[PDB]
Symmetry: D2
Subunit: 247 residues, 4 copies
């Protein structure tokens, strides 16, 4: 019902798509939710669509300074997050021969290093506040599938899974758990506006289950991972893709 | 709310340990729970302990006739299951050199074949009633770890995972999902009664978080897998072990 | 010759298909090869195809007595195996609704329990002769894919993988390693003669590299696993399928 | 033995440890080997040590210009590589609270981005010649274990695995395969000089097999992956750790 009442959750990349849906679900669970995105206008719209439980604070997760200020404002408002959802990422469609060093560095910088910058500051905030926290990072089932046209992205998401596995070991002693979710193809705004939108016919045929994946399919799983019901799960990756791959 | 209100769930091996806790949790969730176990007296006491939401029906999962009777009665009383939790198993402690054909067959027959027998009848019942269904099978993280002193058991639990993956593919078109859970070492009645009770020191040493795993640790995850929140998950395995291994 | 010179390798189910190709390759590697199969005449033909390094001994891997005689004969011929290749299995094509308990037991009985019977006697033979040993079991990438029309088979192969992981733990102390190979679809005598033959179009599309898999593709990896180059590998599963799934 | 006659292989980070051992083994297989390292003097000594067809060319894998120079010289000397082994990396020991952005960026930059830089150039070279190549990247079993005191490293190596899985898909059409190897703790010169050297006691106890892993244990597996025996394997990860974890 309101299992998250009295908890504070930060969701990055929450202006639209999966992050917005995650933010909305955690608010419905009762959490105070910080809606954060590099898109300030989008973050405000998202927090407004969710209601009084949500506040928009813009941040670029690849900018250490931006992240510092984000967490400072959160500390001032709430006394510190209990839940971190690392959702922000660029989701590119780049043919392998167009994957040059500039592109590679860009994706690694945001998707992987940004995830570290945010996790560093966030779990540090959890520990300072004596809170038994939950870190939930959004990876991708492309890591299992080896999906084409996103080579740097697949590398980055593999980095996120590796990071999650190491982090669980490092933070268990502080009563913090770290888990990852690997969504399959999801009909988010970002995917709808991308060449990946064209993959739905193929992917749906490969799924065990019918229909296009929706942001809510992922949000509802993250809800579980943020709850006390998942307290014995740490260092794990949960795959949510209607059966496209098996993990 | 009580999210499982109006739903019927069958939990096998529910007289004690993880099974009883699963049954208790699903009832708390608002389900009508069929508490089934080969131990008829134990099944009765478990259902009594849980409340009016719970009904005991004894069954030997390795016995096709026993299982048929089980499901015939459930059909008569409820109109058919919505949720199947395959929990029943023998959990041995047997040195490799003592793993003979007789032992091997016994473990496979109950833990793997029994699981097929129940799932065959159970999913047929769902389909006949035209119900969206959820099949949740309890495996073991020994499949990932390669734990000694339980070779036949590890083999059988691998089979449960394999069966789960194939089942998800076969049943998705009928709106039935199938997932597995791999508990780590749990302080259940059965474990407390075996040499596995002495393995907690070594196991806790390997966990990211300290403490002995409890039946409720598993029950709470099964609750999630039984719910609408897990609807986009099928063919997957969720490892619940305080980080002893990483899946 | 060269590298397995002096070594004795037992290959079960080696009258045709992958088993035959494995036997041929290990002979080429220099091992004395025991070609075993339930089809006594097929085993004799397969040995003759290989030459002086092969002896045929009929055996039904699911029959404890037959396996016992098999190993007694091998001990006399060679002084005991150094290498066990568990290749025998039934590869069915069976729609889910046709998977009944009789079919399930048959598949489990041969593919999983037979695998146990042979490995029990084989590894016991290794230890009695004080030989370092190598156990290599052929599973299937269907365990990873959740391939339809073979539910009991996928369960059994999941069993073989779990057994492998446990066995590695049990036997390492005796300097015996145990690994598994998961072939993708292979154009073997058996597959040629079954409805799986029609799966090449779909499988090839999923492969990173094109072409129908051949028995030699598997035989050449088994060769590696049988050799000293693999000496630091135990408890592992090597997937050989031109990239249909990623392990 | 001479199975790589006529083939050219590049091994990065080959001045010592696993890299030098890999270089030595491929040379023994008959390949023309380019021994590359950032340690220019060490690379020279290692190539001269190996003799046979080995030549040294210094390069920093994280420096795009350095790598371009490396490959230009290889092309001039040999007509281009057939085999790429991505072995160079930094192996840190850093407590979590000492993992800051500078440390993180450096480990990602060399271990993950350096791997991309070299692979980009190396596979472009393969394709320019129309060769059916082999990419083999050395990851780490720390990705499976979530090992402490190397959070950025574990993330980087997960990235290498992800990269490998995507690359296999991208280059299959050009008949190039891409696989990864995950060594366990190995007694390389680097490790002997690291605080990681102190983990041997615990690790050997967790292994199914006895003894400290050696560079040769890894070199002999890479030899296999570079050969035609591995031709049907792509997108895969082979774990080589005497059974410390199970993959
Ligand atoms: N949609 C899918 O098919 C799918 C599949 C697998 C994984 N994912 C993952 O789910 C998450 C969300 O994906 P989505 O489809 O909702 O994407 P989306 O494009 O719809 O939304 C991504 C959001 O992240 C924000 N963002 C980008 N860079 C940022 C940065 N530097 N700092 C802060 N915010 C930034 C964008 O502004 C955008 O609002 C991502 O981690 C993505 O990799 C998505
Ligand atoms: N306890 C653990 O450390 C652990 C770890 C991983 C997985 N598991 C799994 O959890 C499940 C429950 O384990 P537990 O520790 O609670 O066991 P337990 O011994 O405490 O309870 C097992 C129950 O199963 C019943 N049972 C045995 N054979 C049966 C059959 N033929 N038909 C019907 N019921 C039968 C027993 O009567 C008993 O009531 C099993 O699947 C087990 O493999 C347990
Ligand atoms: N061919 C494929 O696409 C494929 C894919 C993945 C795994 N596999 C595995 O490879 C192995 C060989 O497959 P194949 O395609 O060559 O099969 P096949 O049908 O061509 O040959 C199987 C052999 O096993 C023998 N056999 C059956 N039951 C036996 C028993 N009870 N005792 C002794 N021998 C018995 C048969 O007589 C036959 O000679 C099997 O383990 C199979 O599961 C095959
Ligand atoms: N030794 C282990 O226990 C272990 C375990 C798992 C994986 N690995 C991996 O094996 C590989 C080799 O490890 P090792 O133990 O032999 O290391 P090592 O330290 O002994 O040798 C590494 C070599 O890489 C070179 N190098 C470092 N940075 C470079 C760069 N910028 N460009 C080019 N060369 C560079 C060094 O000069 C050194 O010669 C690494 O990828 C490592 O991550 C090692």
């Amino acid at each position: 019902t309101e299992r998250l009442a009295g908890k504070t959750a930060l969701v990055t990349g929450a202006a639209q798509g999966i992050g917005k849906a995650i933010a909305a679900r955690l608010a419905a669970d009762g959490a105070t939710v910080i809606v954060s995105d590099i898109n300030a206008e989008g973050a405000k719209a998202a927090a407004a669509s969710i209601g009084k439980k949500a506040r928009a604070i813009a941040a670029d997760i690849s900018d250490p300074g931006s992240v510092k200020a984000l967490f400072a404002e959160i500390q001032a408002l709430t006394g510190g997050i209990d839940i971190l959802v690392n959702n922000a990422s660029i989701v590119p469609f780049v043919a392998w021969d167009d994957v040059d060093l500039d592109h590679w560095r860009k994706i690694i910088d945001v998707n992987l290093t940004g995830t570290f910058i945010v996790t560093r500051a966030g779990t540090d905030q959890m520990r300072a506040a004596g809170k038994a926290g939950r870190v939930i990072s959004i990876a991708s089932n492309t890591f299992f599938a080896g999906t084409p046209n996103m080579a740097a992205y697949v590398a980055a998401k593999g980095g996120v899974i590796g990071f999650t596995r190491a982090l669980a070991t490092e933070l268990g002693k502080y009563n913090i758990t770290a888990n990852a979710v690997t969504p399959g193809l999801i009909e988010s705004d970002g995917v709808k506006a991308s060449p990946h939108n064209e993959a739905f016919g193929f992917v749906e045929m490969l799924q065990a289950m019918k229909g296009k994946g929706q942001p809510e399919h992922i949000a509802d799983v993250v809800s579980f991972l943020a709850s006390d019901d998942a307290r014995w799960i740490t260092g794990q990756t949960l795959n949510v893709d209607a059966g496209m791959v098996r993990h």
